[PDB]
Amino acid sequence: LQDVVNQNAQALNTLVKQLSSNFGAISSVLNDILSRLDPPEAEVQIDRL
Amino acid sequence: VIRGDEVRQIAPGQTGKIADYNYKLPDDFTGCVIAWNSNNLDSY
């Protein structure tokens, strides 16, 4: 019974911690990349994310 | 009519006086751009 709780919590923690990954973008923060790149390149950067 | 200096600004996603105050092109434009020197005809 403890393993079900542990596995569900771990999967959710991994899912949330996946928002810290760049995936090749200049930055992982959408607002940060949008605030300093013009649209036709910010589009490309956002698409990878 | 445009001048050769900054003549290349007529294109999607460009910056400058022309593309920001005079004539702006959308990001998803489809169609062709044509230019040619007109010294013999146009040269305040």
Reported as half-sphere exposure (CB side, CA atoms, 13 A), residue A6 has a value of 3
Measured CA to CA, the distance from residue B16 to residue A34 in angstroms comes to 20
A40 with B13: Cβ contact below 8 A? yes
* Element holding A9 (H helix, E strand): helix A2-17
A40 with B15: Cβ contact below 8 A? no
Measured CA to CA, the distance from residue A20 to residue A18 in angstroms comes to 5
Which residues in chain A are closer than 8 Å to B27, comparing Cβ atoms? 39-40, 43
Q: Which residues contact A10 (CB under 8 A, 6 or more apart)?
A: none
For residue B15, give the nearest of B4, B6, B2 by alpha carbon. Answer: B6
Q: Is A38 helix (H, G, I), strand (E, B) or coil?
A: coil
- Sequence length of chain B is 44
Q: Is A25 helix (H, G, I), strand (E, B) or coil?
A: coil
- Residue by residue, DSSP assigns B1-44 as ---STTGGG-STT--SHIIIII----TT--S-------HHHH--
Measured CA to CA, the distance from residue B39 to residue A3 in angstroms comes to 81
Measured CA to CA, the distance from residue A47 to residue A25 in angstroms comes to 9
The 3-state DSSP composition of chain A as helix, strand, coil percent (nearest 5) reads 75, 0, 25
How were these coordinates obtained? cryo-EM
Q: Which amino acid is at A36?
A: R
Give resolution, Å, one decimal.
Answer: 2.9
Decide: B7 and B38 in contact? Cβ < 8 Å.
Answer: no
